Design a protein around this ligand. Sequence first.
Ligand SMILES: Cc1cc2nc3c(=O)[nH]c(=O)nc-3n(C[C@H](O)[C@H](O)[C@H](O)COP(=O)(O)OP(=O)(O)OC[C@H]3O[C@@H](n4cnc5c(N)ncnc54)[C@H](O)[C@@H]3O)c2cc1C
Ligand SMILES: Cc1cc2nc3c(=O)[nH]c(=O)nc-3n(C[C@H](O)[C@H](O)[C@H](O)COP(=O)(O)OP(=O)(O)OC[C@H]3O[C@@H](n4cnc5c(N)ncnc54)[C@H](O)[C@@H]3O)c2cc1C
Lengths: 656, 654
Amino acid sequence: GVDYLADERKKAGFDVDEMKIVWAGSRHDFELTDRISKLVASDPGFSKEGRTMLPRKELFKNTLRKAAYAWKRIIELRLSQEEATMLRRYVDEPAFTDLHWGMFIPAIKGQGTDKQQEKWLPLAYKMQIIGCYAQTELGHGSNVQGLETTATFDPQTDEFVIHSPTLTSSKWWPGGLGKVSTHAVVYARLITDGKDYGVNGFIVQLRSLEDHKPLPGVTVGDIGMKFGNGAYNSMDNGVLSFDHVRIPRDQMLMRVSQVTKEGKYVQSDIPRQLLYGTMVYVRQSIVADASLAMSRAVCIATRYSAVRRQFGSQNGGQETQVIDYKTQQNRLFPLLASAYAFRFVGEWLKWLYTDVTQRLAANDFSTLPEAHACTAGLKSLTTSATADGIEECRKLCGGHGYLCSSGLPELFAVYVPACTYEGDNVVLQLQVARFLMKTISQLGTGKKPVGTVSYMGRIEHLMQCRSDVKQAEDWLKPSAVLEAFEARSARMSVACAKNLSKFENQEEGFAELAADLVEAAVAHCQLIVVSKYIEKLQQNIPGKGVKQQLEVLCGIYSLFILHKHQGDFLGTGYITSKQGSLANDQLRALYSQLRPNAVSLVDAFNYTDHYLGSILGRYDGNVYPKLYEAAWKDPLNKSDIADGFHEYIRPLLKQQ
Amino acid sequence: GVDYLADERKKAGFDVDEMKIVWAGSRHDFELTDRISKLVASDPGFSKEGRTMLPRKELFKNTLRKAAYAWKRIIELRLSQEEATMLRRYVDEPAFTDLHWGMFIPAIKGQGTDKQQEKWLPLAYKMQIIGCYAQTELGHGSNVQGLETTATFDPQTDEFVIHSPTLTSSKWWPGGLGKVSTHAVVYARLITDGKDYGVNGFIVQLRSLEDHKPLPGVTVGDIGMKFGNGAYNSMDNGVLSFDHVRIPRDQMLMRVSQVTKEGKYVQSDIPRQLLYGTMVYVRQSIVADASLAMSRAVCIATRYSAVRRQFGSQNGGQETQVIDYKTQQNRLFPLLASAYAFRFVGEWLKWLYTDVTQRLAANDFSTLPEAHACTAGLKSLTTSATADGIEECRKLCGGHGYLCSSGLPELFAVYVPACTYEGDNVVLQLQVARFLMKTISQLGTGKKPVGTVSYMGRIEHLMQCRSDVKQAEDWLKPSAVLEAFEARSARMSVACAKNLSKFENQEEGFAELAADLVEAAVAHCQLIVVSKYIEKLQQNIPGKGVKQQLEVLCGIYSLFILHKHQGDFLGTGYITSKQGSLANDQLRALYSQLRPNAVSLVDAFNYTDHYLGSILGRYDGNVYPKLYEAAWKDPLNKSDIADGFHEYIRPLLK
Ligand SMILES: Cc1cc2nc3c(=O)[nH]c(=O)nc-3n(C[C@H](O)[C@H](O)[C@H](O)COP(=O)(O)OP(=O)(O)OC[C@H]3O[C@@H](n4cnc5c(N)ncnc54)[C@H](O)[C@@H]3O)c2cc1C
Ligand SMILES: Cc1cc2nc3c(=O)[nH]c(=O)nc-3n(C[C@H](O)[C@H](O)[C@H](O)COP(=O)(O)OP(=O)(O)OC[C@H]3O[C@@H](n4cnc5c(N)ncnc54)[C@H](O)[C@@H]3O)c2cc1C
């Protein structure tokens, strides 16, 4: 087996082994990714062969099998929980285990009392119970405060009654609930003392532990097929309705709020703000996965673009690899750039998480709004860019990209729910907006802004500066780009606050000015990404030519963005046409330098073929023969005559 | 029997029946769509229940049966060609019949001598053969001049020998090829008399008519599974490979090029320019289909946005329909304006086809390079926007949009190939760019330009003019928007062209400025759309409030694009910030007007629930109970214990 990309690899002008380390985040991280990776990859029992053609029932049985087998490797190899996270990542199949570890345990941890965690967590850690997280209902997803499921305390019996008063209050979506889960944390409105104390979490057992039949009064099942072959279809997303299901009182999560023997709401010390610590963690984790999906898609389109030649024969010559084209470059390299950018904004959130929970331990709350907005904005930004980027990578692969065996169709189907869970992307950006608008109106009060909105403390200036770019290369110097993003955002937010303040009723004004508020929120998020990329570049970072390439990636991301939203900077006045053109010319230059390195830079993600499952992105570039061999395995190819043909088509050929 | 959307219907400020007419295109068009669609929709044999969950063997079987049942009704009802195309559209199921009618017949027709169309077309017209169109190879899609499949004439035997020299010469993608077609038009390099004469089409029998087994030399099958549940997996896209298959001399389509007994090449002396069939008609068709897909998505998402409520309870009241939100509006309404806009260009394209086939049949080839780019650029534009709006429409439906049974996942998976077949979108827009660059660099002559580039007969003016919008409503006036877009296109092209003349060789320069060129191409295309819209509004349009509703959508479309590409209006100097904002304020106002009509505007597409196959988009707005009943039909709900459980999960628990 030759490496048909050995020539593209040679052309690299940096140390891939160190790039690997940068992508991974640390030597520890890389060591762990690499060993768990290859260990998932070279094990018969984790094969994805055939997965896309299974009917839902065998797909699902097959998920269960892999789910069990993986648990068994976690045990037999004494992997830590960190390691087990990795192991499941590389198995690469949505399944209940994702929610049990991913949401059910974190909910108990964050919201159960000391006692509650002692009781429920050992069970969940050994999977003597399997739990999911039931919040969304038919009729409520984003608006959590409006859920209809009720939990009504019963003083006569020391139980809550969980009830679904209506069809639409039915739970709908929660993964692992359809078929697998034995228990759920069920969010419902607490009704006690004939008053509504709002939404809380209840640990409700859904099925008998002996035979897995649903308990009395509980109705549970799966909701239906979702988008794509395989994808989330291996996940049992559930509908769940309750008919006065009775639960003991100490099954309410009582960390923050509790209910006495007699009813009556009570509140502990231990601040409800403690929970904002878990926002940051989850959002971080989701931004991390954005860099993961973007990197997988970019890795396939890139390798495919180096191998795919089309046009540009010159006399008898080989045709031009499509990656040599500047239009292929203009759609592809910003996505590459984005994977490294979102990778780094990912690390910066790791830090932001440590900072917030350092402050949470001093009962320091001055930093929380900013932390919340910063994470909402970043989750939104990165999950759109990524969803849009994977469709773009498919398109960049031309017709072959439409084939399941290319890897991109699944990767898009699986990825896209990111845009709606743990916050609708657009709904999160109106939150970002409100906070910027808030941050602007507190200036009058003399309240000086911090973290990621510390730039808004310098508006007088940002309102009136002009870029001073004289040559394309100046767009390379960080202070030029950073200021350019700061100005844009300040100006856009200012323009919103001015526009907004003409409304007597502020709620009216948020409604009417929503589209622009979002446009402002986007600009701010973009600024966070760029400014963190620049911050990253001031770290050391070993390995020959590594930093240098990462600078190239920086420029591309921020200048791609600058061109896309070019009106934003020309509006306000911050840059002139010539200057916009100079940025355009420098992005063009940057594409030409990235070119030799694209394949090496996606080689840096260190993915196996098993994990990638793309014939178009095979490491060795042996694409076409693989696609040919692959077609000869579709069900239709079992014979030269399709079932149906003699019955329906033959008669008509001859007429009958 | 209750319509949850009546309160929205009653808010209409226009005659829906007459908007229906407009959408369809004429009372004749309308009476025809309406009768054939109810026909399909109300016939159990065209049901789509359960499709999406079928394994592939069974989905294919069921395709073959629908196809045959379709042919049986076309015949029993004495349907014409136009009605038959209609019927096949409302069956809503990609199938071989679509290449046979859509590409095999029109290629013979187009590229064959009269003598040849006389022996083949009757055969294909009664479906006594089943043809597909085999151009694309593993290694060559866009680049038709580099297909590797060869066609060597054997003088010693009066035959061409069609051969697949290499694995990557394998024919790959043609639908109807993989299992059903008995013949193909196979495109191959003509090797004759020792010289290579480029691509040509050859009628080749793929399979024994008596028993359907492949003929000696031929290798065919399906290529595998494609994006999305159902969608195109009901189509057998093929791979076909040849070991020197033999074929009579009269199976080369000998209309434009001929080959004589003794070998050797003669040309008909009948201008290969006649192939507007090959372009304007087909691209016309893809553009029409873009409006068709955009309108389905926008229809599901408008209805769903008027049913779904979330937030906005003030004192324990009802939550706000999401359709009242400015962000929903700004994501949804330009999509709705686009369907109407792309619908109207599509009309204008019929005109162009009739104008071009009048001219071609006559003696005038001059209008032709314009007709070519114009249509290329529109295929590109409308398909890109449509594939985007469909994904955007799914996002508009929130979590519920992720379910197959919202209708949207399929609609996206089956539409999106449009961006790649008959011309890759960016490749197509690189061609508009050449034509524009050509149109400039020719101006210094004398011979002023025409059609969709006559605006470049006035570059001098548009190189210097500047907007005089003094308030928001000014952007309503047709002259301001047109001039806004002509100024924009003219400037971008001039800038590209100026930038390019700086190169020693034009090819290197073209390679290098490619993104700026495409960017300029898209601008030229937006102008076309916008200006055909304006012209549409010069027409008699009957019915109360129809024309105003259309004016509103027209503004929406132009100003949404205006805001999105505001850099291009601002940077060239055309407008000032204030004017820019004024454009943004007017767009708001427009959303607010469109609001009460949004649901009636999509009612005017007149789609049945059967066609639309979306619970979220049900005419009657009864969404949630219907989702809930759908869930129970999934095979996982066939019992309470999943297969898998006791074998794998029970021991893990205990
Ligand atoms: C694959 C998948 C897995 C999931 N798994 C789980 C799970 O395990 N547990 C669980 O509890 N849930 C789960 N969910 C539910 C999910 O977490 C989200 O809560 C759900 O997708 C929220 O979407 P929605 O339908 O309510 O969007 P909506 O909020 O109803 O939004 C609908 C549309 O209206 C717009 N809109 C809504 N509000 C506003 C506003 N105020 N202003 C402007 N526009 C607005 C939105 O932008 C969107 O366009 C899952 C969902 C999916 C898709
Ligand atoms: C569903 C489907 C059905 C099809 N059915 C048929 C059929 O029935 N019959 C048939 O003959 N064919 C068929 N095809 C083939 C199809 O019509 C196209 O011709 C083919 O998909 C063209 O794309 P490609 O794969 O050649 O992309 P390529 O041209 O290889 O492009 C790959 C990438 O390279 C880029 N690129 C290529 N050239 C340039 C350039 N010069 N400048 C800048 N960028 C460039 C493209 O933009 C794209 O990003 C079908 C394809 C699909 C997806």
